[PDB]
Design an enzyme around this catalytic site. Structure first.
Site, PDB file in Angstrom:
ATOM      1  N   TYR A  98      -0.878   6.998   3.184  1.00 56.18           N
ATOM      2  CA  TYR A  98      -0.378   6.129   4.261  1.00 56.18           C
ATOM      3  C   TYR A  98       1.161   6.168   4.282  1.00 56.18           C
ATOM      4  O   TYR A  98       1.755   7.043   3.633  1.00 56.18           O
ATOM      5  CB  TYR A  98      -1.035   4.733   4.192  1.00 56.18           C
ATOM      6  CG  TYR A  98      -2.531   4.883   4.347  1.00 56.18           C
ATOM      7  CD1 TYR A  98      -3.079   5.331   5.542  1.00 56.18           C
ATOM      8  CD2 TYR A  98      -3.395   4.659   3.285  1.00 56.18           C
ATOM      9  CE1 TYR A  98      -4.434   5.540   5.675  1.00 56.18           C
ATOM     10  CE2 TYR A  98      -4.756   4.872   3.409  1.00 56.18           C
ATOM     11  CZ  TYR A  98      -5.274   5.316   4.599  1.00 56.18           C
ATOM     12  OH  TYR A  98      -6.631   5.513   4.680  1.00 56.18           O
ATOM     13  N   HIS A 155      -2.591   6.784  -1.124  1.00 56.65           N
ATOM     14  CA  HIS A 155      -3.646   7.334  -0.271  1.00 56.65           C
ATOM     15  C   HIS A 155      -3.171   7.992   1.013  1.00 56.65           C
ATOM     16  O   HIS A 155      -3.910   8.076   1.990  1.00 56.65           O
ATOM     17  CB  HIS A 155      -4.699   6.272   0.030  1.00 56.65           C
ATOM     18  CG  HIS A 155      -5.400   5.773  -1.192  1.00 56.65           C
ATOM     19  ND1 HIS A 155      -6.160   4.624  -1.189  1.00 56.65           N
ATOM     20  CD2 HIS A 155      -5.443   6.255  -2.457  1.00 56.65           C
ATOM     21  CE1 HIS A 155      -6.660   4.441  -2.400  1.00 56.65           C
ATOM     22  NE2 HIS A 155      -6.239   5.413  -3.190  1.00 56.65           N
ATOM     23  N   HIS A 180       0.834  -1.199   0.000  1.00 57.11           N
ATOM     24  CA  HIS A 180       0.000   0.000   0.000  1.00 57.11           C
ATOM     25  C   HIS A 180       0.870   1.251   0.000  1.00 57.11           C
ATOM     26  O   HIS A 180       1.244   1.770   1.049  1.00 57.11           O
ATOM     27  CB  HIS A 180      -0.946   0.029   1.182  1.00 57.11           C
ATOM     28  CG  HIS A 180      -2.086   0.967   0.992  1.00 57.11           C
ATOM     29  ND1 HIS A 180      -2.037   2.037   0.121  1.00 57.11           N
ATOM     30  CD2 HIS A 180      -3.315   0.977   1.557  1.00 57.11           C
ATOM     31  CE1 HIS A 180      -3.208   2.651   0.154  1.00 57.11           C
ATOM     32  NE2 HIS A 180      -3.997   2.034   1.020  1.00 57.11           N
TER      33      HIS A 180
HETATM   34  C1  LIG Z   1     -15.350   1.625   1.958  1.00 51.43           C
HETATM   35  C2  LIG Z   1     -14.058   1.828   1.197  1.00 51.43           C
HETATM   36  C3  LIG Z   1     -12.867   1.322   1.695  1.00 51.43           C
HETATM   37  C4  LIG Z   1     -11.661   1.470   1.012  1.00 51.43           C
HETATM   38  N1  LIG Z   1     -10.532   0.884   1.524  1.00 51.43           N
HETATM   39  C5  LIG Z   1      -9.393   0.915   0.790  1.00 51.43           C
HETATM   40  C6  LIG Z   1      -8.270   0.164   1.200  1.00 51.43           C
HETATM   41  O1  LIG Z   1      -8.294  -0.603   2.212  1.00 51.43           O
HETATM   42  N2  LIG Z   1      -7.158   0.238   0.425  1.00 51.43           N
HETATM   43  C7  LIG Z   1      -7.102   1.018  -0.693  1.00 51.43           C
HETATM   44  O2  LIG Z   1      -6.023   1.039  -1.328  1.00 51.43           O
HETATM   45  N3  LIG Z   1      -8.178   1.708  -1.122  1.00 51.43           N
HETATM   46  C8  LIG Z   1      -9.322   1.658  -0.404  1.00 51.43           C
HETATM   47  N4  LIG Z   1     -10.433   2.272  -0.878  1.00 51.43           N
HETATM   48  C9  LIG Z   1     -10.430   2.748  -2.281  1.00 51.43           C
HETATM   49  C10 LIG Z   1     -10.961   1.694  -3.239  1.00 51.43           C
HETATM   50  O3  LIG Z   1     -10.015   0.631  -3.393  1.00 51.43           O
HETATM   51  C11 LIG Z   1     -11.232   2.306  -4.619  1.00 51.43           C
HETATM   52  O4  LIG Z   1      -9.969   2.750  -5.179  1.00 51.43           O
HETATM   53  C12 LIG Z   1     -12.262   3.474  -4.595  1.00 51.43           C
HETATM   54  O5  LIG Z   1     -13.450   3.015  -3.929  1.00 51.43           O
HETATM   55  C13 LIG Z   1     -12.617   4.066  -5.959  1.00 51.43           C
HETATM   56  O6  LIG Z   1     -13.113   3.046  -6.824  1.00 51.43           O
HETATM   57  P1  LIG Z   1     -14.711   2.743  -7.087  1.00 51.43           P
HETATM   58  O7  LIG Z   1     -15.285   3.975  -7.763  1.00 51.43           O
HETATM   59  O8  LIG Z   1     -14.662   1.514  -7.967  1.00 51.43           O
HETATM   60  O9  LIG Z   1     -15.332   2.479  -5.724  1.00 51.43           O
HETATM   61  C14 LIG Z   1     -11.628   2.142  -0.209  1.00 51.43           C
HETATM   62  C15 LIG Z   1     -12.843   2.670  -0.698  1.00 51.43           C
HETATM   63  C16 LIG Z   1     -14.041   2.521  -0.008  1.00 51.43           C
HETATM   64  C17 LIG Z   1     -15.312   3.084  -0.592  1.00 51.43           C
HETATM   65  O1  LIG Z   2     -12.843   5.431   5.858  1.00 55.48           O
HETATM   66  N1  LIG Z   2     -12.037   4.420   6.327  1.00 55.48           N
HETATM   67  O2  LIG Z   2     -12.272   3.995   7.436  1.00 55.48           O
HETATM   68  C1  LIG Z   2     -11.061   3.945   5.637  1.00 55.48           C
HETATM   69  C2  LIG Z   2     -10.803   4.386   4.398  1.00 55.48           C
HETATM   70  C3  LIG Z   2      -9.672   3.952   3.540  1.00 55.48           C
HETATM   71  C4  LIG Z   2      -8.718   2.994   3.900  1.00 55.48           C
HETATM   72  C5  LIG Z   2      -7.659   2.721   3.031  1.00 55.48           C
HETATM   73  C6  LIG Z   2      -7.540   3.422   1.844  1.00 55.48           C
HETATM   74  O3  LIG Z   2      -6.517   3.197   1.025  1.00 55.48           O
HETATM   75  C7  LIG Z   2      -8.488   4.375   1.486  1.00 55.48           C
HETATM   76  C8  LIG Z   2      -9.540   4.650   2.345  1.00 55.48           C
END
Ligand SMILES: Cc1cc2nc3c(=O)[nH]c(=O)nc-3n(C[C@H](O)[C@H](O)[C@H](O)COP(=O)(O)O)c2cc1C
Ligand SMILES: O=[N+]([O-])/C=C/c1ccc(O)cc1
Length: 362
Positions: free
Chosen positions: A184, A182, A179
């Site tokens: 992190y 975002h 990862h």
């Molecule tokens: C509830 C939720 C949790 C997410 N958790 C992660 C995560 O754990 N790791 C990550 O890299 N992106 C996370 N994201 C981003 C998603 O992987 C994805 O890139 C984002 O939802 C945009 O794509 P979509 O329009 O297909 O939902 C999360 C998004 C949502 C909505």
């Molecule tokens: O809203 N959340 O509790 C977490 C969101 C989230 C976690 C990982 C990521 O890459 C993007 C959003």
């Protein structure tokens, strides 16, 4: 249509190019940040995905930034994940674990010893994370100002990623996704906005990418390069972390370096939920000529956009996030041009089976 054709992704072969994006759902057991059989059922339901990429999972206790996010550092976590990957494999699926350290997107109350979380520099993220209240429900809470890692703490961070990859391989995951997106920890080092260090881990792009490349090298050595993917969000702003004043050049530097390692895939998160400027086709072309593994695109995709970019030879697969929350059989639905189940955002984070395992198949 190319979405329903196979794709070699390093050591494994996906039967289609419709991937499940990593999705934090915050349903793990505390104490212990332990995955559950309910989580196992959720992943099993989605096993027809070309590849499942798990929710972000801690490499260590220090890595934790969200209450309810699972780890892959303890014996109990390893044992619980083994059952989950076995279930996915019993349904002929493939699953990657997304491994993170949250760095400054965290809170002292959930850190070891109740101490400040760590980062590249002592700068507050100025955002929120998700904790749990006294009843176990998800609550959004302002992030704690971090402590800057000491130079002599860096090898330990690299080792934590290495160790988590050893644990992941044992736990039955098919691939690991680092990862590096975002905002992190890895992204905190990459971005000039969050990295004001004046040692070998800050300043120049070479120095800013140093940690992530050390991690990539360590995990390739632990397992194999064809088992390693990486997620980046190197263009635009994500959770207050922009990509600095030379974002494209800096991204292409990182991508050329990653290519040298022969890793399985590059997963580009193109936008957050609020949206923004699309990637230019020129930028996509520059990425494509530099990287010779699989490229996964993500961020408010449609099947039609994925087909367009796959047809243009610019990406190989698409990861869907929210559509995978709501549609366990997203592959079949996209293949048949069926409607998609209505999403229920109130149950994205925390809770139980409702809004998790109760979305129906066709
Ligand atoms: C509830 C939720 C949790 C997410 N958790 C992660 C995560 O754990 N790791 C990550 O890299 N992106 C996370 N994201 C981003 C998603 O992987 C994805 O890139 C984002 O939802 C945009 O794509 P979509 O329009 O297909 O939902 C999360 C998004 C949502 C909505
Ligand atoms: O809203 N959340 O509790 C977490 C969101 C989230 C976690 C990982 C990521 O890459 C993007 C959003």
């Amino acid at each position: 249509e190319k979405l329903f054709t196979p794709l070699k992704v390093g050591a494994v072969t996906a039967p289609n190019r419709v991937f499940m994006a990593p999705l934090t759902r915050l349903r793990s057991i505390e104490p212990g940040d332990i995955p559950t059989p309910l989580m196992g059922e959720y992943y099993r339901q989605r096993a027809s995905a070309g590849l499942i990429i798990s929710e972000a999972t801690q490499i260590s206790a220090q890595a934790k930034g969200y209450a309810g996010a699972p780890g892959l550092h303890s014996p109990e976590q390893i044992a619980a994940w083994k059952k989950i990957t076995a279930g996915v494999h019993a349904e002929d699926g493939r699953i990657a674990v997304q491994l993170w350290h949250t760095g400054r997107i965290s809170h002292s109350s959930i850190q070891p010893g109740g101490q400040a979380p760590v980062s590249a520099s002592a700068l507050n993220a100025n955002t929120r994370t998700s904790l749990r209240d006294e009843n176990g429900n998800a609550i959004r809470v302002d992030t704690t100002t971090p402590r800057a890692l000491e130079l002599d703490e860096i090898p330990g961070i690299v080792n934590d990623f290495r160790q988590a990859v050893a644990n992941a391989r044992e736990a039955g995951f098919d691939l690991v996704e680092l990862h590096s997106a975002h905002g992190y920890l890895l992204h905190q080092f990459l971005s000039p906005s969050s990295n004001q260090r004046t040692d070998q881990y800050g300043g120049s792009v070479e120095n800013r990418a140093r940690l992530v490349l050390e991690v990539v090298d360590a995990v390739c050595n632990e397992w194999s390069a064809d088992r390693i993917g990486i997620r980046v969000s190197p263009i635009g702003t994500f959770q207050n972390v922009d990509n600095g004043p030379n974002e494209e050049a800096d991204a292409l530097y990182l991508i050329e370096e990653l290519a040298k390692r022969g890793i399985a895939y590059l997963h580009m998160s193109e936008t957050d939920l609020a949206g923004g400027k699309p990637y230019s086709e020129a930028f996509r072309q520059k990425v494509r000529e530099r990287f010779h593994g699989v490229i996964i695109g993500a961020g408010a995709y449609t099947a039609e956009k994925a087909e367009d970019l796959i047809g243009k030879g610019l990406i190989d697969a698409v990861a869907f996030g929210r559509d995978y929350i709501a549609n366990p059989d997203l592959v079949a639905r996209l293949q048949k041009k069926a409607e998609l189940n209505p999403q229920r955002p109130e149950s994205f984070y925390g809770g139980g089976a409702e809004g998790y395992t109760d979305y129906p198949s066709l």
